[PDB]
């Protein structure tokens, strides 16, 4: 009845090795691994034979109709809608043996069939199915490609030759995608014939701190761990290992590493350089940080501290650069006191009070202190910001709100994903609407013309934005080169002017160059378009040039002597407007009304928002919110527990920074007591075992309070692994094991009402 | 009347192991009166072969392992291989409750909590000359220094 | 379930007649829905019924210097204020030193400035939505301590390196294809091992489909086979025959442990569930559960900021995916033993002392000896519970005449203006014309359901494989599937402005 | 209230409207990437000036590829890691109760269960207990059932 | 670990200057020279599949590396007893393969 | 209760010397100060400082022999290898417009005179446009300037970077270059479409057309499906080659359609470890 | 090949400050909030 105390008194476990609930199984974790798909195969043998004879045994062997039933019916991978069937021949016959002749192949092969070797090659049957993909002809009658290059590639122009599986595959006609493109080429081995993407090969992922992960074991989250390079991820290969390191610099580092990079907990000392990704300025010579470690940068918690000029700080780090809630003080008062020969108690008593009346708490964002450009008080005032707006507008976006809301949870999934789309190009055209309408313009003498604005363009896109980028508002990023401030020192004009027109200069010089190199290949061969338009995102631009041409009177002289852009119109929009009115009983006057009492009356929400429908995952705070007092005071508490775990791997016995940098008065090294089996000079009280109890401690009464601390922790270590069978009442273990107890009892009652209710059902 | 019970055992549920909300059990009585009791020594242990092939996998895993220990001072001993372990739990310097690191660990752990130190450890010469240690010179010793002082 | 300090922002005196599913999140999404519907009320019913601000330290600064005292200042005055009159002064504006010493402030700034001086001087659901916003502003804060996206690079900014380094600074094993290619290659020496494949034919859609592999002669065979052998021979090598004198070894050596050290499955499973308790009562004891935006933060981080101050277990050498189908490593597979390197254990004995004191220190030393950082710490802890026309004349005029009335800026100008661009109109005749006989060719000879591009159909289809419904069949979207989900979105938009239309009638 | 319990949480319904726009954003971004490496490497090897092979060549940055987030599951940029559920083993052992009560009707009575009397079952006993039984990761009580399931007697 | 037993000689050429400590310190994922062009070395079967490396773990102290050729792959079990099976080759498929595999190595999870 | 959960403790390890103040031999756990440990000596009343312990600067040979021990490296030594030099100055393209995807715009919506006297004062947004468009041709003729670019292979260094973001990296940051990526020979075809339409391909043209009622057909040229196959596999050469498909008839549902008339060396992979 | 980029932290934190000080929506306080940045600066 009672689960915790179950009888001990035989201990037998009945598991067999390899177990076959871990060894027959592919995990879907496993893709992208090529012998993984051989496995899954032949696990799926593996099921057909227990199905047939109760055993992972064929009765003779693998037949040609386990061969058949693999490959045709067990992986049946899922495809688009079917196109239209035809039910007569739109071709033929001219010459014997043109075409392929007019229950499925495994029932046939079960029934009594054989498999005899054909006589035509590979190349034949691909190049009929890329016939049929296409639904044209892609051969002539002399063996002579249609839409493919006939001659052999000018190696003197920089091309090499092509074959027709490769070609005809990666230039193809729209609604041919790349799955049945492999096919119908019959792209089949597993290792040699498939190569991964670049955006889509495997990586670790990336965790950050570890916290705030989906569960997939909810009593063990460190699982959720395991596909990623953290410092507790479980069974990492190699062990994580005690480094001492000194570097040519001096910087030393002591504590946990992985793969030799400083990855888990330690400290570091600062030499002439730098390290722990901190900045170059930051640091002096023996300067310290204690505290956690990611791929060599400070990351977590931590404490850095400085003996030259006396500043300490405790909190939170990441990537190495004081980010989060901290406390800072300033010691140096102390420790200048210290080097002029006081002695501490004195020195303490000197300086204590200027010392705690000078501690600052904190909010850092990236290495710089939050609080003077009015960071704490943004979300109220844009709260407040929202209500300087006339009533209708409110009134209407939260209705827009409610209404969202409903119509996403009625959605289908195919729904779902076309209003994302549309909701995708509603964000682009805010930045960039095109000019659909006013690229190409036929003046008189007909003359089919373009349209540049004053600066010469046909578009708004500039393509230097890839190289500087650019903000949110539009405006150009940094630099190679810049002033400090530019409304203070603007750029003097006529070098402004100047290196503007150079810069169109360029632009001429660059069309010129691109419609060398790539203007003469055709993409398109109905429109006209070719590769230097394509290339360069200009589709837009030759489907109103063909519409233009077409009405121009030169065209419509082409066109009898050899005898655009938008999904909807406006007289449509404004008919289904007009027709949505009537719905309601909503007559024109009532929009006339209702602005009349908005016009009586006379970037909208929380911009630290952590879920915003409207996104591109691109516009960043340069802020966060402060932290209140408690928050720092916990971080503070939590950091000097991180500090004193880290401090433990600060002196390795015969480690390099132990050998060198353990020093006397002068510069000679020193015999540190740390071997195993000696206690020299009358300190056998420090040993751990029953030898250290039988000895005498000194009577100073400081080392006993040091003694009683360190006790403490280890007291606290041993609590967390060793627990009592028959804990007390009124204690905490016995707190837990009754809730414990009571969930158990919990879930059996539910369990119960379930097992009645299907009783119920199945009547 | 089952629904009101079932709403509520599932809201009890809800906020079971919040450690900070107190519960009616958590100082209940035991059905039986305490007295204290240890869990009974198991005396029968039938190993399964996937036991078998772990505790070899983890032998296989610790055969180059250094080891290290902490003092009374938290101060760290020097490098530590099996027989130098050997030698100081025969002396007394340590014992089942020290802390030690070694590879396969993130931090510093008791020997008897850490999986097949003390089988490592405990030869049968290393047991004999241990209780021969304990009873012939660290116990009259120890009475003699509670006597002394 | 609301706390305490959401129960005194909202009015009282509201009845609750349902029952809401347990959780933070749904309690948050009530609340914010009553503000959200009772400021609706407040606009609908206010629309069914019926300011120079000046600096004065620039006030005081023009007010301190006098012109008018002598004929050289007053002359600078006369010369600034004719060439201010002429460029600096707008129409709207009615006099030059009325505007040398305005403050300009936009409307809502100025609206706000005296919302918030009328506040530091001295409605229903204003606190209460104030309230909700820092909780939103807390959550963003939150995910920097989990997976989140980099994907702004600026100066200064440090976390998208340690992003790249945590990805690809170490190394991962997974087999892939590039790790079995860098392994074991073929060294041909006789030519390619594959060849050309040959169609099969049997004797009793659109694709002809490869039947070359019909044959147990052929590569696939052989590699199923290989599979089945090396399957059959890793589980013979386990068989308790070949390991016999394995089991003699480790059978010593697993009784040199104390008997007690032996755990069930179910005592192992049970001390894992005690660590992990106590460590969540252990986290009920700092200063974080006296923040306002606790529970927030325990909902979605847990009750500290480190992993390492919570129960996990050291498993910290060996291969994750060389040991996946030999050891169990989770409690959530089947009842094993997982595969450890620390043991939580009963105790065996009374402890009498605390186990780590010496004898010496039994004798009154129960000290909580208090540092610097420690007293600092309570402290707050206990605090919680003339000339200046001629200048600005000679900088006007130089100003003036640097960025207006300069001839060479004007020419650099109309160079740009002019002539380069009428050079790149040229050029674009000349490529326009080039790309017009190319469409003519195929004019020559010549006698809604279209698809999108590549891009829109495999980003449709991959949303529609995330879409959490069973997975449906992949489409080639059109311009008509487009255009009906634009029109559905604008009839929404339309009817519920015509809902609140009616509503203000 | 009655729009809270209907279902129109805020929270899960802009979550999956943004690891949607995640994915579909993701792939419009690599396309047009494609696009633009692909021109600069035809201007470089058909027109043999190299400052387009280095345009090339810094479009192919790794600190470039990892920032922009493309190698990366979206639902990491929703923040939440990418889980295998039904990698985890179905049985009797650690079962959520409706499932393992299906197991207990499925052990005797030998007839497997279709999905039309399994609805029902579960529709039932969900409406047994009101529906406050947790039924996601992000419910609390999922720990506690975890809890309560742990034990295999003997 | 000293500095010249990793010296190479003459920035271009990768080999060690000092061939006489070679052998000391060596990753599993270092070259091995025996397959240099022109070299008539001895045959080893049990390195077959892993030509390239000098395909084992003899390691010291604290001193073990491990670059994609795993622990597990060198040291443990039916992995490393795999990777050398072209040792144990002599130097029909349809029917006597499974009926060589069950009389000769029988297991009840297959054939029972 | 305290606010300090854990003790904090001093964790130094002790030896024995003489005390000089005491004058005693003494146990203590006082070590010097890390502020000059390493720096100096004192065997004599007189004091040695050490000249070359700490390295206090690099240059390119004392980078070559420390290039794998340092804590950092900065920029400048970096500046000149330039798969390192785009490391620190990325490219920062940033907030795509798809103008290739998006060719559509669901709605449909000339050297003109104007006299000063007409006119407005511009709303202070659209004059920062203004501004925006004038430095982004500035910037072009800074970033992407010919002159400079014809002369780059051989007598200048101009190359495309961002601006730059780090001045000081991790030293196993070059670790990230070690999983190559394919060379773009592999990605994309090395061979142009047609540049003209001769015969046969007007003809296999019309057919098309015919086929789909003039509403034709758009192309689309991407990266590659799969590797080529004649570098794993013996294929059958078709020396004079002609294809000659074979295949099903065409289908529908005169109109008869008709067809238009008139030792191996190994290469060294990237994709490897 | 010597082609120069200069470190541009500054100039980032000066339009980070205007930026964050636009947000809200007070920059009446501009002048001052730049002007003691700049002067920290030296
Ligand atoms: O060049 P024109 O065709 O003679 O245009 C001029 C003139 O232009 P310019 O002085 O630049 O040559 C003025 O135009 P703005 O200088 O104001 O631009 C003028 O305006 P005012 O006489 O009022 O100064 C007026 O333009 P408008 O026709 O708008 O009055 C006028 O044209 P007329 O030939 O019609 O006088
Ligand atoms: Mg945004």
Redesign the interface.
Known sequence: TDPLKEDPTVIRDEAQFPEPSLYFKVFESEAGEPEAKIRADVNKLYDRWIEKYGRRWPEDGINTEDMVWLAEEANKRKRAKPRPRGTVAAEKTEYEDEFMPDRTNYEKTVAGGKWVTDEFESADYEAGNLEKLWDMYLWDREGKPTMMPDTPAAQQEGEESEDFDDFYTAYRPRDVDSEEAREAVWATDEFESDEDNTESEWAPEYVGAGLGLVAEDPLNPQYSLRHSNHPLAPFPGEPLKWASYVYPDFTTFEGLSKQSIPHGMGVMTFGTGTGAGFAMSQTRYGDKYEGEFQAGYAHGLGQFTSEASGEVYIGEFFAGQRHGCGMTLDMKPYFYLLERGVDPVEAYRRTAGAIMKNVEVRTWYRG?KLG????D??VE?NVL?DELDDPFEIALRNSLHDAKLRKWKAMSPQDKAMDRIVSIIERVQRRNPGRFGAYYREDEKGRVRPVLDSDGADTDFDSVDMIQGVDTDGDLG?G???????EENPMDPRIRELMAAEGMDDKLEDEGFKDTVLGSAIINPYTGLDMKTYLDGKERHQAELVSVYKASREGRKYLNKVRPGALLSREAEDDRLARLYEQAGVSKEDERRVEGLAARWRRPGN?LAANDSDTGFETES??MEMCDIPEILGTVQEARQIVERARMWRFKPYGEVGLRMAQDANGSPVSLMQEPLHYPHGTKFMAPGPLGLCHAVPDDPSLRQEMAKVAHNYAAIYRMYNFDWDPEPGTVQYKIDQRIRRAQELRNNAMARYLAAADEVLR | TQQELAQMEAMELATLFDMSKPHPLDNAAPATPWKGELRPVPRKIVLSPYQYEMINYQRMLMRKNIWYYRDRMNVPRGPCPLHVVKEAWVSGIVDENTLFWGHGLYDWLPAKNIKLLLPMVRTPEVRFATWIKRTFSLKPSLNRIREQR | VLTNTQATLLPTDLQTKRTIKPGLIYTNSALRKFVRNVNTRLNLKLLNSKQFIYSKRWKSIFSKIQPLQNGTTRKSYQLFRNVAKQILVTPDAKSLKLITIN?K?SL??RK??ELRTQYNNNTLVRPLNVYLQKEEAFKRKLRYYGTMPMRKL???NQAPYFKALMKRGFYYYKPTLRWRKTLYVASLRRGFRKKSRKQRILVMSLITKPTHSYTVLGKRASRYRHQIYKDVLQHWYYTPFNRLLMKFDVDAFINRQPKSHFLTKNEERALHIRRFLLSEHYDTLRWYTYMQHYKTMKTNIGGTKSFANRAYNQQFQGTFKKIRHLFAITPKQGDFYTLKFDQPLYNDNKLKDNLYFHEELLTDYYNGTNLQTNQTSNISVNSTTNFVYSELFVKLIKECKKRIHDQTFLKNYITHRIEKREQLNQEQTKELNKRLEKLKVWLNSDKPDKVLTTAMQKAVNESISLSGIMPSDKIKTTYGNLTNAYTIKTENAILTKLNVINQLT | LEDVDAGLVTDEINHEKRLMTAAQLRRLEVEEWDKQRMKNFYLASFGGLRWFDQMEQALHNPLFIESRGWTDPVQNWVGQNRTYMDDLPAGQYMAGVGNAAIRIKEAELKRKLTDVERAHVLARGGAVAGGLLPQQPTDPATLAVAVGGAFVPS | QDRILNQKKSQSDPDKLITETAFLNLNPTDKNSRIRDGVHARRERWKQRLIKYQAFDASTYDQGVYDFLTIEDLNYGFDRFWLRRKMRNHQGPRVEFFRILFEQFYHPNFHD | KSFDITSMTTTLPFYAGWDESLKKFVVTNRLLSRRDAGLSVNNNPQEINFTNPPIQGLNEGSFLYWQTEMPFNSYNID??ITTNQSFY?PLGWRRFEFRHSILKTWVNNKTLIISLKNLQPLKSSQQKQNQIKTKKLVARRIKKRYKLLKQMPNQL???P?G??LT?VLPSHYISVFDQQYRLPRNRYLKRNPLKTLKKTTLLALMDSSKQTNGVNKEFTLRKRVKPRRKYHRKRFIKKDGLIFPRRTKFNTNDDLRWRPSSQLRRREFQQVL | ??????????????K??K???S???????LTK??QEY?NLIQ
């Open positions: 710089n003077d450009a009015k960071e008080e943004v005032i910001k940094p190679w080169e810049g002033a400090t401030d530019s911009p340069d802020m | 403050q402030l809502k700034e706000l400035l600026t100066v200064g | 500046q000149f100055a260094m101009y190359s970077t601006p730059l001045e | 090949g010597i082609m120069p980029r200069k470190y541009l932290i500054e100039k980032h934190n000066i980070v400050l930026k964050k000080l947000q809200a929506y007070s920059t009446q306080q909030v730049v700049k």
